[PDB]
Design a binder for these strands. Sequence first.
RNA 1: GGGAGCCCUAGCACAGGUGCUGCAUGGCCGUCGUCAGCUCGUGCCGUGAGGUGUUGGGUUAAGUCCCGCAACGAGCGCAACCCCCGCCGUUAGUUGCCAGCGGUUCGGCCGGGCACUCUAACGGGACUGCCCGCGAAAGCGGGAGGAAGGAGGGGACGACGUCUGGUCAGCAUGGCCCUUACGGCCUGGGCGACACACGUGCUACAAUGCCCACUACAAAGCGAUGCCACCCGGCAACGGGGAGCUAAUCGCAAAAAGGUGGGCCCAGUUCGGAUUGGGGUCUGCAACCCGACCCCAUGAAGCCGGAAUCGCUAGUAAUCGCGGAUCAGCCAUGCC
Lengths: 206, 155, 80, 24, 60, 98, 127
Amino acid sequence: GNKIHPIGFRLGITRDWESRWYAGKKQYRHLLLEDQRIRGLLEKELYSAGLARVDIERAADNVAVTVHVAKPGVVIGRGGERIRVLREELAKLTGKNVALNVQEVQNPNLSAPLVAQRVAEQIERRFAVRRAIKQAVQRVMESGAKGAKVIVSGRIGGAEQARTEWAAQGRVPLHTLRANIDYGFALARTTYGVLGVKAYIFLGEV
Amino acid sequence: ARRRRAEVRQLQPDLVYGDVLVTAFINKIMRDGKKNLAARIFYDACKIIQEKTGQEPLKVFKQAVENVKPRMEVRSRRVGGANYQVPMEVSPRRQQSLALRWLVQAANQRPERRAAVRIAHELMDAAEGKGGAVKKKEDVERMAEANRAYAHYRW
Amino acid sequence: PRSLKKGVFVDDHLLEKVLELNAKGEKRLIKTWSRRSTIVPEMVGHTIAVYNGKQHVPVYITENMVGHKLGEFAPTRTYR
Amino acid sequence: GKGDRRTRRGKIWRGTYGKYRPRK
Amino acid sequence: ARKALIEKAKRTPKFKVRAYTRCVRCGRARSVYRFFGLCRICLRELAHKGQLPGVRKASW
Amino acid sequence: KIRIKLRGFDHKTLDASAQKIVEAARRSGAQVSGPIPLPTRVRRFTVIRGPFKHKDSREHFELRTHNRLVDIINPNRKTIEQLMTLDLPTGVEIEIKT
Amino acid sequence: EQYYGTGRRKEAVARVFLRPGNGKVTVNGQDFNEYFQGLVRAVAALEPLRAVDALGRFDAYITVRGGGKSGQIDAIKLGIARALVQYNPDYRAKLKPLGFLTRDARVVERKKYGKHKARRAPQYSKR
RNA sequence: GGGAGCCCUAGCACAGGUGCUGCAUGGCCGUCGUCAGCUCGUGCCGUGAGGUGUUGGGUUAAGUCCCGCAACGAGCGCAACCCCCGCCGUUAGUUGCCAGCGGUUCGGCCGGGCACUCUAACGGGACUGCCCGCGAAAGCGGGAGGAAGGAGGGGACGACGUCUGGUCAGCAUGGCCCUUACGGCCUGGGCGACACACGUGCUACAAUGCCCACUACAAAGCGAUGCCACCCGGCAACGGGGAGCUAAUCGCAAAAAGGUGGGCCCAGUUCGGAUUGGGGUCUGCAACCCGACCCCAUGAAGCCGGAAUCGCUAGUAAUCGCGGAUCAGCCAUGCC
Ligand SMILES: [Mg+2]
Ligand SMILES: [Mg+2]
Ligand SMILES: [Mg+2]
Ligand SMILES: [Mg+2]
Ligand SMILES: [Mg+2]
Ligand SMILES: [Mg+2]
Ligand SMILES: [Mg+2]
Ligand SMILES: [Mg+2]
Ligand SMILES: [Mg+2]
Ligand SMILES: [Mg+2]
Ligand SMILES: [Mg+2]
Ligand SMILES: [Mg+2]
Ligand SMILES: [Mg+2]
Ligand SMILES: [Mg+2]
Ligand SMILES: [Mg+2]
Ligand SMILES: [Mg+2]
Ligand SMILES: [Mg+2]
Ligand SMILES: [Mg+2]
Ligand SMILES: [Mg+2]
Ligand SMILES: [Mg+2]
Ligand SMILES: [Mg+2]
Ligand SMILES: [Mg+2]
Ligand SMILES: [Mg+2]
Ligand SMILES: [Mg+2]
Ligand SMILES: [Mg+2]
Ligand SMILES: [Mg+2]
Ligand SMILES: [Mg+2]
Ligand SMILES: [Mg+2]
Ligand SMILES: [Mg+2]
Ligand SMILES: [Zn+2]
């Protein structure tokens, strides 16, 4: 049972909405759908850049997609011939003229979505889970951070009986709103099932 | 009440006799939150206590409550055997409640059709010593001093 | 206490079929799946086979049962 | 009371209006 | 649900009363809040991911 | 006498851009009728917490639209010229009548 | 010229205006008794004036918005009690211990899910 | 003659499966339990599993704080940070008014002003801070001042774990399985079947009541191929006409118990509205199976319920109406 989404809980304060636009009760439904299509075409094609998040904003018909990736190299390409292809491939699903931006991630080891995303990929490359997690945490703790915590789900190691592996140090104060705890979930499509990687990263206070 | 001894609430005095007992009665007469026509009863009852008796109603209501208050009652007890009906004293707080409750209940047994009347006659009859309320009081105290043998469990 | 306003309803593929067989003789049996259709006076005669989710039925058609709906005569469920 | 269709109380309970609870 | 059973895609449904909803995200046919076009389960997921702008944990 | 009903899903961003619409003057050019409060409309959705059963779970979500009014009396043309490219909020919208 | 207090009670708001006068209270363009016709609790709206000796030494133009008449009674009561203190700050002595200055913050409790009614819990079997 | 595109058979790579497996999984949920608990680092003890800390004495809603001590600290929990309610202020005047004067087609309708109510952003406000008594301290009892006083009221929030708990039919997803049917489309039927039994409810059995008429006070919500003022026809559901409202401005909308008047007079009744016969309305291609509503007639059982058994400690239970979601319509008395 237990434990609400540490994002959706803090959504009020310490964390703001991924897509932040306004729409009436005859539009909201449509903008939302297309907004989703963008995230889908984005999370698939930009995997290599490792996209932490995608901010989307709207106004006088136009749409300001502000992609946050660790390596903006892979979204630019031939000095452009990639950020053009993708601002183009968005122009088809969105008939409304898009504007793709790219945001550097100073510290991939301070964005929970990426940390988790990291762990996920190892588990498919059959890394040792226990270490992966203790390591992943350290890489996050070494990069500043007031605290951090990772969680791998079940079937660690092909093991017939699903388990759960842990690791976490510093403070990770879940019930305090005044927190800022980036959360990130990564899936791990292994040969013998699926695994879930949850990553918590505490930082700052007020 | 596991923690604190739990205090009694202080009902604001009557609007017409400026009394606390009369609010209490009115509250026991009331059902389903309809306090307006519970008072609309007790007072209608009060007009009737005069146009059937030279006495002032407050003095009579008070007079009859006293005749229904039980000095003794039993409450059961589980021992190293079974149920023993231990004769207890009855606190002045509990005599209040018991009297009033008994008065309304007795009143609503009556065959008179208007509510005010039933209250009226019960309130009267009880002052003058008789009436169903008093009977389930002279009764109650009769079970005490009958289980007198079990007085030695005074709690 | 039912419902046919200023419309009245009879599913028409069955109707153009029965009125057609009122230019001459009465076709023994008509295979319908539309129990939906009210009975018109022009149906009094030819035995219609109302379906059932399982079987067309020999519903002979008296004049004593005009205003009624077809499916009122082909019981659906089976009981004891 | 609330069960009888042809009354005040009853028509109020079942959303409706009619002969027994005029709309106005 | 059944991928086949998105003949909700059937733009003409023959009669407008065969028109139904379905979650535009998961296919769910049974709690599809029409404002969002999403089913109840998808709504809570998207709400928590903060991809429903303006939508928030509500308490009073 | 121009009419401007402002509304969005966030109110930190409203009152900080309705304020930026009252940049004609504080009260020295056209009258200015102050940023008008004007009640917010709250839609609510109530979702059963898990998939499959557990009726008694439930979790509340709301989406609230906040609405402002402002309204300026006697529109000098330079006051209007300022209604051009002078904005920053993205989640704020703008009805205009006269 | 007059004297004023607000006084709210459980989703109801009175506004109390105190004129010097004969004791005529009017509530919402209507007589005081025409408005609380046959509600025994009514007389208790004027329990401040009764207990500072003012029952007939003031007229009172009172506007009342919201809720239900019995809360409007309690809210007028607070309204009066407040006006009568900004008319003579000394009145508190024979007014505060009675309680008339306090505002009754007792308000309807929210409906909780999985309950029937905030606290009324659904009935269960087999245990 | 050869060919880009979309249409085309007859083959192949594949689709598709709400078929199996929570007895392989993720995710999300339930549950003990919003219970006050679960641990960790380092030291110390013990051959060792382990222990100490976290035991003791006070105290708290609380491993809450205090005092003590081979322990000194720390993390997840508690509390606080967020929200709604209660008092007050500043900003703000196409909602609000015998506040104050002018006009009245006696409606805040008009001029007119925002004081007040409100609306909704930002702030103040509480701290055992002040006094008296017990206390080694934490705190306890009481008393002032205050709208509120020791957690002011209600939310959101659920620890390490437990249940090999629920869910592969929401969604993923390993494996196994079917592949002119375990896929796909129709039309009709079913999910609504009735000798029976249980759960959760609704409506009752009436006089603190029921009926009719008049009249008074809400909050929260929803409204465009929508809410429907008002007018006309109909006993009525509703049909015809039609105003306003992208709604603090128009509408749903009547709040209902309440209050005043009248009727019923202890009766299975002017209690109760089940059943059934008839005549209609509206929604939908379509209401037989199986819609809701209106009207006429019918007027069942039920006189407060065995053994047993549920909820609730305050604006609570009890009681009264109102709204939304889903949704053409509606079986809603359910739920929020
Ligand atoms: Mg044909
Ligand atoms: Mg009746
Ligand atoms: Mg599928
Ligand atoms: Mg449908
Ligand atoms: Mg819960
Ligand atoms: Mg209530
Ligand atoms: Mg070609
Ligand atoms: Mg396959
Ligand atoms: Mg599971
Ligand atoms: Mg607790
Ligand atoms: Mg030893
Ligand atoms: Mg050793
Ligand atoms: Mg110990
Ligand atoms: Mg101790
Ligand atoms: Mg602690
Ligand atoms: Mg807490
Ligand atoms: Mg104020
Ligand atoms: Mg005048
Ligand atoms: Mg002290
Ligand atoms: Mg099972
Ligand atoms: Mg069923
Ligand atoms: Mg059962
Ligand atoms: Mg008419
Ligand atoms: Mg009468
Ligand atoms: Mg009973
Ligand atoms: Mg309790
Ligand atoms: Mg009831
Ligand atoms: Mg509906
Ligand atoms: Mg309802
Ligand atoms: Zn869905």
